[PDB]
Paper text:
RSV F is a class I fusion protein that mediates fusion of the viral membrane with a host-cell membrane, a process that poses an otherwise insurmountable energetic barrier to viral entry. Initially, the F protein exists in a metastable prefusion conformation that is anchored in the viral membrane by a transmembrane domain. We find that antibody CR9501 favors the opening of soluble, prefusion F trimers and exhibits distinct competition profiles on trimeric and monomeric prefusion F proteins. We utilize the unique properties of CR9501 to demonstrate that the prefusion RSV F trimer is in a monomer–trimer equilibrium when expressed on the surface of mammalian cells. These findings suggest that prefusion RSV F trimers are dynamic molecules capable of transiently opening and dissociating, a discovery that has implications for the structure and function of class I fusion proteins as well as RSV vaccine development.
To validate the model proposed above, we sought to capture the prefusion F trimer in the splayed-open state. We therefore preincubated PR-DM with CR9501 before addition of motavizumab to drive the equilibrium toward the fully open conformation. Therefore, we crystallized the complex, in hopes of capturing a static view of a splayed-open trimer. The complex formed crystals in space group P61 that diffracted X-rays to 4.1 Å resolution. Molecular replacement identified one RSV F protomer bound to one CR9501 Fab and one motavizumab Fab in the asymmetric unit. Because P61 lacks a non-screw threefold axis, a biological trimer could not be generated by symmetry operations, indicating that the protomers dissociated during (or prior to) crystallization. Although the density for the C-terminal portion of RSV F is not visible, the orientation of each monomer in the unit cell is compatible with the distance required for Foldon to remain trimeric while also allowing the dissociated protomers to pack along the sixfold screw axis. We generated the biological RSV F trimer by applying the threefold symmetry observed in previous structures to the monomeric complex. This model revealed that the CR9501 Fab bound to one RSV F protomer would clash substantially with the motavizumab Fab bound to the neighboring protomer. Collectively, these results suggest that the trimeric and monomeric forms of soluble prefusion F exist in an equilibrium and demonstrate that binding of CR9501 favors trimer dissociation.
Residue numbers in the entry:
A (entry chain L): 1 to 212
B (entry chain B): 1 to 35, 35A, 35B, 36 to 82, 82A, 82B, 82C, 83 to 100, ...
C (entry chain A): 44 to 69, 74 to 100, 146 to 208, 215 to 316, 338 to 351, 357 to 370, 407 to 408, 459 to 462
D (entry chain H): 2 to 35, 35A, 35B, 36 to 82, 82A, 82B, 82C, 83 to 100, ...
E (entry chain C): 1 to 27, 29 to 212
């Protein structure tokens, strides 16, 4: 079995920049290597076969190079459709061994999230519980601080955030803070607020609804 | 047929590198079995093999000149380059190149040969002076040039029979001077033009002089 | 009569770097895919011949060391920038390896753009591929071992590059070069393996250690001097007597 | 060449796994095709399970040399995967792969035809149907000319859940968030879609929830107020 | 290595006389070759592979030999054979050549023609004067040129250059160049050139008057 080493572990460059991912190998693999694109949620996508040859349908900006134990793939211009995880795979010695992989992100301008809050549906309150979903759509960068305030009381442990991978269309993220409570505790309060602290905001914004 | 011709500086300043190139036509060095050698000859001494290259880029040198010799081919140009570093007053020689084949270990086809003289000296020009007649004989005289040789001819190479070219002799001041006479009929004087052509290529000067009584 | 008797065997490995082919389905290209099917039909005939497992004993020994894993990687990487390499195998013996043809470069450099075409490019390819069609055609009938070493097994220009690099004496290189057709008649080409994009066969050239010694014909056999003794058909040519260790028509 | 899988999403421990993969666009007895199985660990990279050649020769990775058993059902043009006595370490996404070729002088290592992947989760716990509750749009979920609206997928096990809007008609401005493991042992996620605020009350917006591990398909309509 | 010993070092014979050169080697050598070098010209291959004769050379030249001894035999010598012949080996490295046999033609005693040339006006306008005494077509090489300036012998200011043997008549040429300054030229009157040759029973004298 062959130990595959890839470098770096994660990078981030602007659009149209030049990226070069090297793939370090254990022993000599000659001209046998495969690069794969894997966008999150999708299966692996073949890009480079045989170190330097290109797969049919791959854009004209992916270059392969290297023989033996030192290999490298290059992107002529980093595009929004290239945000994925890239691995290198050998196939001379059995078994076939993959690499850790490299996550590729894109540096863009500062984007501020749009705050939309939803009240718990009436269909959920029948079951005896309630959930308030706070949405932060299309923002960059990824760092965000969300903290609920129920009747001006900080709530912790009952809130659950969820961040998506960086979008492939505009290089923006999305956060969904779900605050779970019970029907008994829900009907005992009136104000439900979602405080949002992001870099692209001169002051924290909060979208709050009543009637609870 | 096969042709070879050397090319390089006729005067060297001591210890400076000497780049010699031998261009060939009529054959391609890339053809298997082909080779190109180098042979020198110091004045007064016999021949001496230097180096050779082959189509497979296999090189063989002479242990007499181990450190300084370095040969390299050029199939894309039909030429062979030979570098000789650190030149020395003893390395004055007439350098020849030649073709060699693995089927017969020798040099069959040869080149004209270039003269490289090893001296801390200043390049000189041609000093030509006539030798008027008074069967009669006439000629020309050369002085203080550098270095040997210089090709001489009469009437653009038309006058050949009875033409002599004396070898140059060093004088006490340490330069070069020879003579080149030609025996002509006495009746032809005054009616036929006689001009000795001198072309010192190491100094790049073309001097023609008319000989009249 | 002079002499030219064999004393040993010069072993060597000849490689022809092949190229892997991927999906290729896409007038001038009509003849491309036809000479492409011959390349497919020829490389598969070599692998099926390889499926089957004492004069050339010193030569075949190398063909069973190449079967070892990673040994092909030693050779395939040795001939990276050139066509002549010497490699110390697992046995510690250093064998000479020459990369005659480079089909790995010609296919990935010139056929990837068109398939994945000028009529001038189709011409030269049929010649580069025809040699493989012939080397396979010869290896398929003689059962892996062919003799004499033909032009396709080793061309005139490539046998000389081998004899020149042969660790032998100086004049014998002049002897063998003038009698190359005799050297071929006393040689052996041995198909070895096909894997890892390499076609390698072991060529066995004769080693003439006894030259320019008196010999005489006519007890129906030859007699050649050899270290104070005399030995015993021999392929004669002009004044040279060629033989190995075990109507006197026309007049001149 | 296209590949489609079929396997269990939940598999109780210490039992053999029944994966399958159908081949289309090329016959299963095609020349120079090595049908390969590859799984991908969560958070990490891929792992080569092994392949089964068109001839029938199978090579399994030395770590799983005794637990694998790949098949070739030529009459149905498909090949399957079987892993014996699964544990909690085998939980991963299993991808179906193949290696097309023309001339093979080395190994078949390239993979152009892949599969969607079977999220296989192995645990002694049982399944659970998801809870679909809509996130209705309102005057607070608006912002100028647009209006956010979605539906919450709550209380389900195990992964994954397929969310579709208008049966694939609406695919722009849709963001499905990663699953969240709640207080109990049940996952949950929210799927919100951005839509112009002038089209609400005039077009039907129904979110489709599909949970294969428990055999469930829910259709919940979202609407303002 | 392989060293060569060529004998004789210098041989003289008449036109049509059989001449054989013997060139022995140190170690055992398979093939031996031969070359001809005219004065100034590049060498030319005569005999290749011990006995075979190269193209462009008449059958007058022949060779034989093997092992550590080799010979090059000329059937009948010719005036156009005046050159320096070598024996070269290609059986081992480094490639080595012979010693060098320079052959001279045996010739009837030829009486030379004596000339004299005063310095030209172009040289006198530069500050130097060179009187050249010409000798042409004689045999053998022995000749003595003694300058005399006003019945006084000169030495140290005269230089003599000799032409190589001609390939048609096997004769020689000499040019004695007396070197002096412009001041020492206009100081004397007559300038003679005394030449003594084996063909001349008495030394002929050629002189002139300044201006």
């Amino acid at each position: 079995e062959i130990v595959m080493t890839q470098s770096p572990s994660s990078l981030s460059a602007s659009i149209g920049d030049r990226v070069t991912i090297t793939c370090q190998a254990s022993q000599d693999i000659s001209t046998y290597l495969n690069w794969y694109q894997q966008k999150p949620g999708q299966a692996p996508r073949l890009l480079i076969y045989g170190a330097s040859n290109l797969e049919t349908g791959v854009p004209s900006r992916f270059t392969g190079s290297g023989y033996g134990t030192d290999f490298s793939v290059t992107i002529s211009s980093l595009q929004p459709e290239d945000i994925a995880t890239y691995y290198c795979q050998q196939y001379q010695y059995l078994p076939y061994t993959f690499a850790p992989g490299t996550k590729v992100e894109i540096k863009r301008t500062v984007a501020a999230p749009s705050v939309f809050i939803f009240p718990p549906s009436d269909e959920q309150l029948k079951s005896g519980t309630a959930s308030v979903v706070c949405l932060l759509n299309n923002f960059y960068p990824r760092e965000a601080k969300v903290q609920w305030k129920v009747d001006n009381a900080l709530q912790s442990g009952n809130s659950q955030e969820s961040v998506t991978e960086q979008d492939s269309k505009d290089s923006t993220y999305s956060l969904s803070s779900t605050l779970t409570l019970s029907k008994a505790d829900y009907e005992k309060h009136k104000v439900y607020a979602c405080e949002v602290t992001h870099q692209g905001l001169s002051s924290p914004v909060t979208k709050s609804f009543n009637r609870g | 047929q096969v042709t070879l011709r050397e090319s390089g500086p006729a005067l060297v300043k001591p210890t400076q590198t000497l780049t010699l190139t031998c261009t060939f036509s009529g054959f391609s060095l890339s053809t298997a079995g082909m080779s190109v050698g180098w042979i020198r000859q110091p004045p007064g001494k016999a021949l001496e093999w230097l180096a050779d290259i082959w189509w497979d880029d296999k090189k063989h040198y002479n242990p007499s000149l181990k450190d300084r010799l370095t040969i390299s081919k050029d199939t894309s140009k039909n030429q062979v380059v030979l570098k000789v570093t650190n030149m020395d007053p003893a390395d004055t020689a007439t350098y020849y190149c030649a073709r060699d084949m693995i089927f017969n270990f020798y040099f069959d086809v040869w080149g004209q040969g270039t003269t490289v003289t090893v001296s801390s000296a200043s390049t000189k020009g041609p000093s030509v002076f006539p030798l008027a007649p008074s069967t009669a004989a006439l000629g020309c005289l050369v002085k203080d040039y550098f270095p040997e040789p210089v090709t001489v001819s009469w009437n653009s190479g038309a006058l050949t029979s009875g033409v002599h070219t004396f070898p140059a002799v060093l004088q006490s001041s340490g330069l070069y001077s020879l003579s080149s006479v030609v025996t002509v009929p006495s009746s032809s004087l005054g009616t036929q033009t006689y001009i000795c052509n001198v072309n010192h290529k190491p100094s790049n000067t073309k001097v023609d002089k008319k000989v009249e009584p | 009569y002079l002499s030219a008797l064999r004393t040993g065997w010069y072993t060597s490995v000849i490689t022809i770097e092949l190229s892997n082919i991927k999906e290729i389905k896409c007038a001038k290209v009509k003849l491309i895919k036809q000479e492409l099917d011959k390349y497919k039909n020829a490389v598969t005939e070599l692998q099926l011949l390889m499926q089957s497992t004492s004069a050339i004993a010193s030569g075949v020994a190398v063909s069973k060391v190449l079967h070892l894993e990673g040994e092909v990687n030693k050779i395939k990487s040795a001939l990276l920038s050139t066509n002549k390499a010497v490699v110390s195998l697992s046995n510690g013996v250093s064998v000479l390896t020459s990369k005659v043809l480079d089909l790995k470069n010609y296919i990935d450099k010139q056929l990837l753009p068109i398939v994945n075409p000028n009529i001038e490019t189709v011409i030269e390819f049929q010649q580069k591929n025809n040699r493989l069609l012939e080397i396979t055609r010869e290896f398929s009938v003689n059962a892996g071992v062919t003799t004499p070493v033909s032009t396709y097994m080793l061309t005139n220009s490539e046998l000389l590059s081998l004899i020149n690099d042969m660790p032998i004496t100086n004049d014998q290189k002049k002897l063998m070069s003038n009698n190359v057709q005799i050297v071929r008649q006393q040689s052996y080409s041995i198909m070895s393996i096909i894997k890892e994009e390499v076609l390698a066969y072991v060529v066995q050239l004769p080693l003439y250690g006894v030259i320019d010694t008196p010999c005489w014909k006519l007890d129906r056999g030859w007699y050649c001097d050899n270290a104070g003794s005399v030995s015993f058909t021999c392929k004669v040519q002009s004044n040279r007597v060629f033989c190995d260790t075990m109507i006197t028509v026309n007049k001149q | 060449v296209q590949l489609v899988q079929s396997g269990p999403g939940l598999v109780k421990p210490s039992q053999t796994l029944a994966l399958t993969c159908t081949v289309s666009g090329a016959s299963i007895n095609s020349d120079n095709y090595y049908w390969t199985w590859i799984r991908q660990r969560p958070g990490g990279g891929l792992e080569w399970i092994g392949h089964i050649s068109y001839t029938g020769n199978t090579y399994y990775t030395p770590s799983l040399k005794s637990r694998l058993s790949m098949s070739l059902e030529t009459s149905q043009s498909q090949f399957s995967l079987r892993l014996t006595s699964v544990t909690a370490a085998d939980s991963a996404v299993y991808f179906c792969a193949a290696c097309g070729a023309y001339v093979l002088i080395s190994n078949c290592g390239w993979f152009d035809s892949w599969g969607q992947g079977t999220q296989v989760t192995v645990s002694s716990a049982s399944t659970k149907g998801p809870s679909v509750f809509p996130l209705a749009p309102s005057s607070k979920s608006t912002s100028g000319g647009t209006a956010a609206l979605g539906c919450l997928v709550k209380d389900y096990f195990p992964e994954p859940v397929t969310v579709s809007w208008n049966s694939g008609a609406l695919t722009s401005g849709v963001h499905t968030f990663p699953a969240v493991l709640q207080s109990s042992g049940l996952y949950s996620l929210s799927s919100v879609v951005t839509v112009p605020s002038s089209s609400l009350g005039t077009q039907t917006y129904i979110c489709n929830v599909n949970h294969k591990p428990s055999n469930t398909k829910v259709d919940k309509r979202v609407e303002p107020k």
